[PDB]
Amino acid sequence: MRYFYDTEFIEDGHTIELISIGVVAEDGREYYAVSTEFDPERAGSWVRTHVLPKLPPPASQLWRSRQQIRLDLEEFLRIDGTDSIELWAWVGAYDHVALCQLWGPMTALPPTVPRFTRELRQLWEDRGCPRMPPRPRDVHDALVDARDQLRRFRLITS
Amino acid sequence: MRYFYDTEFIEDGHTIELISIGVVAEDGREYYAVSTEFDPERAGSWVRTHVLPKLPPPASQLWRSRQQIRLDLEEFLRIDGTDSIELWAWVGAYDHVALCQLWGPMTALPPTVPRFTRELRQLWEDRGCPRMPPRPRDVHDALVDARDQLRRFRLITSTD
Ligand SMILES: [Mg+2]
Ligand SMILES: [Mg+2]
Ligand SMILES: [Mg+2]
Ligand SMILES: [Mg+2]
Hints:
- Chain A is an alpha/beta fold and 158 residues long.
- Chain A is 30% helix and 22% strand.
- In chain A, strand 2 (16-25) and strand 3 form a beta hairpin.
- The interface between A and B is medium-sized, with 29 and 29 residues.
- One magnesium ion binds next to strand 1 and helix 5 of chain A.
- The site of one magnesium ion has 5 residues of chain A, from strand 1 and helix 5.
- Chain A: Its cofactor is Mg(2+).
């Protein structure tokens, strides 16, 4: 059923170049990967400070090609399975396009991947903005971010 | 306060090339523009069939540059006014990027335009999936589409 996700990326008003993605399933499974295809030279100051230093070391198997990350996710999301998939992100318009561009144009998205991501901030506001935990130390690590989204969703829906 | 919008675009897995944008405010104001800047040749079968035919004639004043559309939206969304700006779209991830890319990077979006677009499909499901009127015949005209979203929003929230 439900997956909470986050991405880091380099975006220049034209393209969204994916750095990393973290996805946590409501059932407890977690996926994290760092693309070996983004060019770190194209990173702006803010990404260079806040995103790049938090990445795994280069010898880590967490570093995957774009094709591997897409295949990992088709497996992780159970694209062939019983369940309806619901994707959730916090202020995730760009995150949604970064995710979907792992398959290509929106035309190429597998049939069972939803064409919209539910917006966790919208849910939170619709429930009167209940108090959240303070943001983690390691924000801008996408897996840390994704785990925190699930934590919030659980708090919001209790 | 709330604006409902829709965009049409040529998207290829790499970029989103804006064809048109329609925005409708809750107070009745409407904005619609078609960009002079996208390359119609690039469009696939679907956009050639369902989008390009609905666009205004070449001599329409609705055809504007991307710079003009940004300037027009800064004025239409009342970016220096005191109301909080709330944007809504239906299944709006790519729409939101197509809108915000009129200012270039994310970084450059005026501080007063929100960094996310509320998802009307998410609201619908939430308030119990109420039966909605049928989509208009003339959908894929961004302004007709945006009007219809405002309509559905009013219906969905009418007993909130
Ligand atoms: Mg994020
Ligand atoms: Mg690859
Ligand atoms: Mg993040
Ligand atoms: Mg649309």
